[PDB]
Symmetry: C3
Subunit: 402 residues, 3 copies
Amino acid sequence: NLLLTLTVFGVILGAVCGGLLRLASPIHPDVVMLIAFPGDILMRMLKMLILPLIISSLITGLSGLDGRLGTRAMVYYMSTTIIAAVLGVILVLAIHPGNPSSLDAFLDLIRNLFPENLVQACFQQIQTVTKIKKGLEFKDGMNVLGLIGFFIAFGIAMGKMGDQAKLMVDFFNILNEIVMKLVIMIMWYSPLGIACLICGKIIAIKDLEVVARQLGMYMVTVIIGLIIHGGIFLPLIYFVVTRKNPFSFFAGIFQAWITALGTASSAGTLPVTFRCLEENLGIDKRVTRFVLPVGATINMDGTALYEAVAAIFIAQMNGVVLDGGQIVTVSLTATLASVGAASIPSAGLVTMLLILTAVGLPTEDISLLVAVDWLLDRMRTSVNVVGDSFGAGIVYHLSKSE
Amino acid sequence: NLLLTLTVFGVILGAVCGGLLRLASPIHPDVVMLIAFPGDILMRMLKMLILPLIISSLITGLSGLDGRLGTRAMVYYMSTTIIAAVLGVILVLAIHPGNPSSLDAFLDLIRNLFPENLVQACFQQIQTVTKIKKGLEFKDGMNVLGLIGFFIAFGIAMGKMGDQAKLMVDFFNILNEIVMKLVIMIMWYSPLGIACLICGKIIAIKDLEVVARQLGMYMVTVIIGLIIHGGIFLPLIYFVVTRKNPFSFFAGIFQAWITALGTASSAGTLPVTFRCLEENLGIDKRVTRFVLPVGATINMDGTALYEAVAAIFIAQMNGVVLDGGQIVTVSLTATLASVGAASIPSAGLVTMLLILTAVGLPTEDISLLVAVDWLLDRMRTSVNVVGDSFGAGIVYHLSKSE
Amino acid sequence: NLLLTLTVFGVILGAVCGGLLRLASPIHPDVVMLIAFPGDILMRMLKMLILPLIISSLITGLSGLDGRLGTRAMVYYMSTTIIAAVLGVILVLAIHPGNPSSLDAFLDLIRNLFPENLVQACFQQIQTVTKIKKGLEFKDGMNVLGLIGFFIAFGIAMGKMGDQAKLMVDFFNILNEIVMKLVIMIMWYSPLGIACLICGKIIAIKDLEVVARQLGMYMVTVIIGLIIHGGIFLPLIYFVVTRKNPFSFFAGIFQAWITALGTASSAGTLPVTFRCLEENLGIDKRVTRFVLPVGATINMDGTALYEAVAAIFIAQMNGVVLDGGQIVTVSLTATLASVGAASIPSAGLVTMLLILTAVGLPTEDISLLVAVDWLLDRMRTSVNVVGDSFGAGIVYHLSKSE
Ligand SMILES: COCC(CCO[C@H]1CC[C@@]2(C)C(=CC[C@H]3[C@@H]4C[C@@H]5O[C@]6(CC[C@@H](C)CO6)[C@@H](C)[C@@H]5[C@@]4(C)CC[C@@H]32)C1)COC
Ligand SMILES: COCC(CCO[C@H]1CC[C@@]2(C)C(=CC[C@H]3[C@@H]4C[C@@H]5O[C@]6(CC[C@@H](C)CO6)[C@@H](C)[C@@H]5[C@@]4(C)CC[C@@H]32)C1)COC
Ligand SMILES: COCC(CCO[C@H]1CC[C@@]2(C)C(=CC[C@H]3[C@@H]4C[C@@H]5O[C@]6(CC[C@@H](C)CO6)[C@@H](C)[C@@H]5[C@@]4(C)CC[C@@H]32)C1)COC
Ligand SMILES: CC(C)CCC[C@@H](C)[C@H]1CC[C@H]2[C@@H]3CC=C4C[C@@H](O)CC[C@]4(C)[C@H]3CC[C@]12C
Ligand SMILES: CC(C)CCC[C@@H](C)[C@H]1CC[C@H]2[C@@H]3CC=C4C[C@@H](O)CC[C@]4(C)[C@H]3CC[C@]12C
Ligand SMILES: CC(C)CCC[C@@H](C)[C@H]1CC[C@H]2[C@@H]3CC=C4C[C@@H](O)CC[C@]4(C)[C@H]3CC[C@]12C
């Protein structure tokens, strides 16, 4: 992919330039600002497509693209993704890769899920404050959960309406097309932006060793989680429901997992994994003809885990402890973000700002995660492919009523 | 109505549970919070449909559903409703059921009617402040009058456009359908919410007697106003315009008023009141074929009076004196709220938050009003039916040009 | 034009009433407030159509109404308008008609061009603050550049889509029609509003001589700029590109410039200037059949210059020095405002609030500018007509590939 290769070239460049300036001399604060600036603009542009993207995606999907076995597949996907995101959260909290009022927080979480006002939720959200007299107060920051929730309601309502809602459906389809064009164009400007951010981040970092160590630890944490979710959770769930050998199930797909790593894209891995389940496992083409394609765009357990660990890592590196609700916000958004990062084209950096915007984090340290995304990409892709295959086996096993 | 009966069952339950907990022991503040919480969410959900509801209703109505006699009917309706709402206001201020800078307030009222910005008006509104240097400042709280006003302008503008605006009209029709589905679904969750609110309200109340006394006084105040508007104002206006016996006019409709109480629904009272004016009064089927049906969804004088007295009662119980503008805001919103509470299905609790949101009141004490709405419902229904009948007589009398 | 004559009659009236009250006695502050009040409402109404107008105009234009020679015409127009607006800015700063952190300001300018959030930008915008620790902070005031920019992106994206975006295009066309009806209706209420504002402004002014002197100086400044742009810049550019006699080019059009002054409307001047270039200069009817009509609604160099000098004059009279970014905001909005004041019907007062809202100025002193707009209108009209003629010559000269 020209842009993936372009983004990595930009990273290297950005990195080399930052290193050169640092070893050359201590850069003036105003000049570091001007150095990282074209990265600020990359974020500002992407972050300004989040809201329209959330609204069009939710309403275009839940209406436009809505049997029993289909229900089974969706249940497996959502369940596995929530599992993956929760694993991510536990590991990033335990491992703590990033190195720097209980009921009330969850109470606010639940309030922010029903924003008193749609508009205001687009930029701010409710918080509890202690005065020992508690109050609600606004705090800046878009209510991602507030809006996602209400638009889910709205989309499910329209969807039920039927051809009566045709017009509004078509309008929102057009909107989604326009916003996706803009995301594509911005991600084309991304390589420069990422280069500038990395060059700036290096010039600011006080001890390369510490930051290098933290980022490496984050990568291992993402790695560990991909292994546990795919190597243990997926296979165990297979057995618990199928009572069959997960290794026997996995033995056949070896070619499929290989294509997964090889193509680094479920889309390109898709025809091989058709073959591997139809021929080797002998899964009914029906189940194979639905679970595989649907999963290729929504079942992204590896993506969700990466997105949760990354969000708490950025939190941690910024000396910010997330409250119980903020952690639930990460888990909820991480799952949605992965079903998006999978559907929306070149939306890898959009979704990560969505999760960070949702927890109210800096959103600048997103640059470090990019510097290493290219290594973690292979694994996370393969994890997503594996899950879809297990799902097809599970759906087929749970579909013997026939 | 399963839901009306459900809501009353919920009230009783809520009440019994609150009473039990109170007589059992003093509940911890955090636990009372968790008790009333599912009521907080009922409000948060309803209040989040106000804005879309205001926009779709105004634009779908003033465009989609827009002779001389028709003009006459609308004039009578709007006039009588404003009269009913003003009577409500005077009585609630005089009686004062709830028991706890002149020009500037009306000046702000007039400003808030033309919000400098549509978006900002969706969550905040202009106020005057004294520094002896006066200034305008924002104060949180959706500009209900700001938005209603501008959308009235917008809808009247589209309406005139004609079939040219077809598309935009159809789009907003679909929106209105979706938002009404959501209001219906939430009001289904209402019974639990109302029960929780009442249980909490009882646990907090310090002296049951005082609150019981206040709520009873509010009910009598609503009652008195229904009597004065229907028993005096309506009949007097009939004579002043018709110069005929209002008792002679009322004598025939007795059956109609009975059905009104019996069906507790103008809709179910509708065929009887057709009969009562066509047969007994001998009103021309033409006038009867328009005034009755149009009124059955817009002429709600009893509803407007209830909605104004309730709004100032909630104000009063909360030790808040309304300024001259806030009182005008209640009168204006109360009239619109009654034409809505009449059109929008199961919108009894939505409209009351609209009036409270408009005056910027607590919006939680709405629970007490629900506890007694079921008693006042009968009377207010009959008052609305009576007004429509008088209107048909007045329109027919004012339509002898023919 | 009944309304132009009405607006001037209102000015005279307003002025006479203000003068009478002032010579009669010192008016009470509350009564001056009530005097100017119906002007406040004129602004509040107009300013509340800016946002919808910006959105519908940008999306209806850049999509609905989008060869080489056509590209040439647009380049000439945009270039000449930016030149005109910059001349305006320099002159108003130099002459200083109105009589009362470098990089950071431009950095904010560039940020406000990519608002992190669409909604929030509709009412507020980013600023740098010094604590010696710099921060970004919100400051009230709609991000005109933020929204214009993003909608330009959105419209260009839809435009490319093609007939696929038909629906959304038609929807926004309808919206634009509705908003334009409202602007027309408000400008009908303008005469009273302007009269009230002028009556109030006179009653407040402490020294008529000083204010009279300042306004006269502003008029000369607008005059000087119209002369320099039309008398020097336009003709020079003609020669630089054509290497032909600008006087020989101008000699023929004399009749065209006359109609310009005579009709005080490029629209009415349009058939004469067709004649003057086709017959006298002998410009190919093709170029004449495009450059003239397109320019008659977008090439408004005289309008842009007026709008920049006016914006900085209102700034200056209000003892407000504009930062480097605010000046660029004026130049950018002034150009857009002139292409609008030209397209949108009776949008002379809307566009001036847009420029003032963009720089965050009082927006009330707009009354003085109206008091003298009628004199400056003749000249600015003729300047716009002249530019279109020069453009036709330049486009024809640059189009001899043929
Ligand atoms: C036979 O197969 C049938 C199948 C049916 C598909 O149904 C759709 C239902 C909604 C769903 C799951 C779909 C696609 C995009 C999904 C969205 C991506 C967006 O991303 C987010 C997060 C990140 C933001 C940047 C944007 O918004 C979410 C809120 C948004 C999202 C998760 C909302 C839900 C959407 C699929 C067809 O599948 C193609
Ligand atoms: C022959 O008969 C012809 C007749 C013509 C009807 O014309 C329509 C004109 C607008 C009007 C009066 C109508 C219905 C809903 C009315 C709305 C209910 C909403 O409620 C509110 C307040 C409460 C909020 C929760 C929502 O918004 C208002 C702002 C909204 C409202 C009052 C705006 C005005 C609307 C009727 C047909 O009648 C069916
Ligand atoms: C053969 O001829 C072809 C030609 C093609 C025309 O293409 C269109 C492209 C967009 C353009 C330049 C056009 C008309 C209105 C223009 C708008 C007026 C508005 O005014 C503003 C400022 C003032 C505000 C009050 C409203 O918004 C701008 C943001 C808005 C504006 C400048 C955005 C750009 C628009 C012409 C046809 O021409 C008729
Ligand atoms: C100010 C910017 C444009 C300077 C250049 C920065 C680099 C990193 C970026 C920014 C915009 C990018 C281009 C924008 C879009 C395209 C079209 C696509 O089909 C191939 C890649 C190509 C041609 C990109 C190559 C790299 C690019 C030039
Ligand atoms: C958490 C909630 C759901 C617990 C139950 C609370 C009670 C008061 C409410 C909430 C939702 C309600 C249900 C939602 C919708 C319907 C469908 C309708 O056609 C009949 C009533 C029925 C079946 C309602 C009965 C009462 C109900 C169960
Ligand atoms: C409160 C207002 C209405 C008082 C009058 C103020 C004056 C200055 C204004 C306000 C509204 C204006 C009218 C509104 C619209 C029209 C219709 C148009 O085809 C001719 C002019 C005419 C008839 C205007 C004449 C002047 C007018 C009466």
